[PDB]
Amino acid sequence: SPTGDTLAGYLRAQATEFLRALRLHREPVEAARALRRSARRISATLHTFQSLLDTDWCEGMRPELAWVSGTLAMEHAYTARLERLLNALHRLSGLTVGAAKAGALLDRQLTLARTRAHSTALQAMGSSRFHAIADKVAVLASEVPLTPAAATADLRPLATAAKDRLTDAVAALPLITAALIHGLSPDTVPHPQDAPWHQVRLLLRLHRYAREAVSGPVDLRLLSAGQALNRHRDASEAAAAAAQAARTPRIAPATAYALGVLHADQRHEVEAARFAFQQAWQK
Amino acid sequence: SPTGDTLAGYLRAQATEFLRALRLHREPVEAARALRRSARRISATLHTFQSLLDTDWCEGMRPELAWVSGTLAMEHAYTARLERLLNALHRLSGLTVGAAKAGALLDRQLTLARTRAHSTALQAMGSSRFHAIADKVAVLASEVPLTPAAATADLRPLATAAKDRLTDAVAALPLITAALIHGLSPDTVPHPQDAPWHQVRLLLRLHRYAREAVSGPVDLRLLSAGQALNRHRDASEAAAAAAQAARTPRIAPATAYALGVLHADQRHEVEAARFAFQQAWQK
Ligand SMILES: [Cl-]
Ligand SMILES: [Cl-]
Ligand SMILES: [Cl-]
Ligand SMILES: [Cl-]
Numbered sequence: 001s002p003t004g005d006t007l008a009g010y011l012r013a014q015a016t017e018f019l020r021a022l023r024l025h026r027e028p029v030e031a032a033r034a035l036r037r038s039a040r041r042i043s044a045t046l047h048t049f050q051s052l053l054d055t056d057w058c059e060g061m062r063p064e065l066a067w068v069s070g071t072l073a074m075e076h077a078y079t080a081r082l083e084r085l086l087n088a089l090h091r092l093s094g095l096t097v098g099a100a101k102a103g104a105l106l107d108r109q110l111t112l113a114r115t116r117a118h119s120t121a122l123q124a125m126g127s128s129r130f131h132a133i134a135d136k137v138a139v140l141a142s143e144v145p146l147t148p149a150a151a152t153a154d155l156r157p158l159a160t161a162a163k164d165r166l167t168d169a170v171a172a173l174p175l176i177t178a179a180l181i182h183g184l185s186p187d188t189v190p191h192p193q194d195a196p197w198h199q200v201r202l203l204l205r206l207h208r209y210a211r212e213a214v215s216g217p218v219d220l221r222l223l224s225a226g227q228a229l230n231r232h233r234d235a236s237e238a239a240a241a242a243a244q245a246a247r248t249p250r251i252a253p254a255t256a257y258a259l260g261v262l263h264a265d266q267r268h269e270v271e272a273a274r275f276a277f278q279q280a281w282q283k
Numbered sequence: 284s285p286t287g288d289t290l291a292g293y294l295r296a297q298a299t300e301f302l303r304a305l306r307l308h309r310e311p312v313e314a315a316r317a318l319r320r321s322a323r324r325i326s327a328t329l330h331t332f333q334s335l336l337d338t339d340w341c342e343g344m345r346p347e348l349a350w351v352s353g354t355l356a357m358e359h360a361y362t363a364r365l366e367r368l369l370n371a372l373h374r375l376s377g378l379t380v381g382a383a384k385a386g387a388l389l390d391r392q393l394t395l396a397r398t399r400a401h402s403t404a405l406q407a408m409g410s411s412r413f414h415a416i417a418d419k420v421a422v423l424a425s426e427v428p429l430t431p432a433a434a435t436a437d438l439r440p441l442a443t444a445a446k447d448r449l450t451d452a453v454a455a456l457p458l459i460t461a462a463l464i465h466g467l468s469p470d471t472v473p474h475p476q477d478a479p480w481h482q483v484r485l486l487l488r489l490h491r492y493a494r495e496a497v498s499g500p501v502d503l504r505l506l507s508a509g510q511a512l513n514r515h516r517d518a519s520e521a522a523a524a525a526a527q528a529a530r531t532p533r534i535a536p537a538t539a540y541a542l543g544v545l546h547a548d549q550r551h552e553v554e555a556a557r558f559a560f561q562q563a564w565q566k
């Protein structure tokens with residue numbers, strides 16, 4: 001039955017996966033994903049099981065790890081968003097000049113975003129900030145700073161706590177059985193209900209990785225819930241890219257009209273994703 | 284049991300309603316609707332029961348009656364379309380400048396259309412074309428040109444034939460359980476499936492009025508089917524007004540974007556209406 005030592009084994013294993021990926025990266029796309037997957041697990045573990053670990057160490061590690069996994073996510077997020085949007089436009093045509101223009105506008109904008117993200121990420125990976133946090137992960141592959149009592153402490157109550165945080169958040173979401181035309185400011189909260197759903201997406205991930213830690217170094221219902229929350233997030237962000245593209249100066253009316261449809265489409269996918277999550281969560 | 288004489292009684296009664304409305308009109312909005320409702324019934328009757336009536340007379344009456352009921356419908360169609368579209372924009376906001384501008388654009392355009400329709404219709408009603416067809420309706424209030432055999436002929440087989448034409452057309456529609464971005468030419472058939480549904484709307488009306496004729500001078504399922512087909516038609520025409528408004532020169536991108544959403548919304552109502560019809564028709 002799982003203890004501090006199980007927790008240490010899980011942390012050492014993830015740390016080692018991070019160092020493997022890092023070595024592969026320094027011979028690339030595969031390695032970066034492996035770096036994300038492991039960074040995110042370590043960061044989660046340091047949250048859920050913080051009480052069994054040195055507090056300062058946790059607090060120093062977590063934002064740095066978050067900085068790493070976020071920096072490494074950006075290129076891919078822009079790449080998948082473009083694809084999602086081009087697919088949706090093709091579908092919504094059933095390209096007329098409007099759709100074709102919107103497609104080319106987003107291809108230009110998101111490609112720039114991607115290329116910018118790609119170079120920023122490679123810069124980050126050569127930086128002294130990155131090296132320092134990677135060095136700590138190297139230490140963690142050998143030594144885990146467990147608190148004195150940790151080695152004998154039962155991990156299950158901590159995992160349960162994470163499960164509770166998830167289930168209480170879900171209980172607080174509205175049932176299902178739109179704001180499709182809105183403007184755009186940094187003061188606008190155009191889609192306010194997105195935030196609780198995106199928080200649940202994170203809590204669900206915390207719970208998944210806690211189950212992993214407890215098992216140490218397949219629930220299909222949770223995987224289905226988790227897929228639905230990724231579509232929620234992706235559709236949400238895609239809709240926002242369409243809206244924002246519609247504010248680009250000098251675009252033709254037909255282009256903005258297409259982008260209006262595309263924003264609406266992706267907001268319809270947000271709602272479907274919320275329904276899918278609900279069916280999966282309630283079985 | 285219904286015969287030629289029942290048919291004559293129904294025609295005389297409708298003709299008389301048309302003359303009443305016409306007299307009221309020449310002391311207005313109420314009277315014009317009554318003129319439509321009766322014209323349409325006479326025109327239907329002359330179609331369904333054409334075999335019991337003088338052919339030339341029928342053929343002379345029908346397009347003239349169609350010209351009357353269509354001319355008199357236009358003002359109202361533009362009025363209801365504006366309302367439907369303003370309601371939908373308010374709903375779809377949940378007004379931002381985009382919505383507000385689209386609203387004002389459509390208000391201007393459809394108001395012009397309405398005022399133009401209103402004056403064209405009053406012109407038509409003062410015309411010698413109108414007077415000639417109204418004069419024939421006056422004759423029909425007294426004498427019906429039944430064929431020799433009509434007085435003894437059973438009306439039910441004719442009514443049944445109309446029912447069959449409806450039920451066969453319905454059988455030929457696709458089951459349910461989009462082309463949201465398209466351009467606009469007089470060669471474009473942007474929403475091709477609309478035509479069979481709109482034909483069914485007319486066949487259903489023919490059937491309703493035949494049931495009336497057979498009864499002589501409440502099925503809720505048929506009324507529900509009929510309501511769903513009116514929404515289909517109204518949503519269809521509303522979507523086309525939004526698309527067309529988006530081609531107005533010099534509109535702002537935000538205005539076109541709103542109109543894109545609104546077209547999509549009304550196309551979603553077309554689909555819902557098709558589903559509603561289907562549930563009502565299959566009970
Ligand atoms: Cl930062
Ligand atoms: Cl948005
Ligand atoms: Cl004509
Ligand atoms: Cl259209």
Ligand SMILES: [Cu+2]
Nearest residue numbers: 190191239243
């Ligand atoms: Cu939005």
Ligand SMILES: [Cu+2]
Nearest residue numbers: 473474522526
């Ligand atoms: Cu259309």
Ligand SMILES: [Cu+2]
Nearest residue numbers: 264265547548
């Ligand atoms: Cu839509």
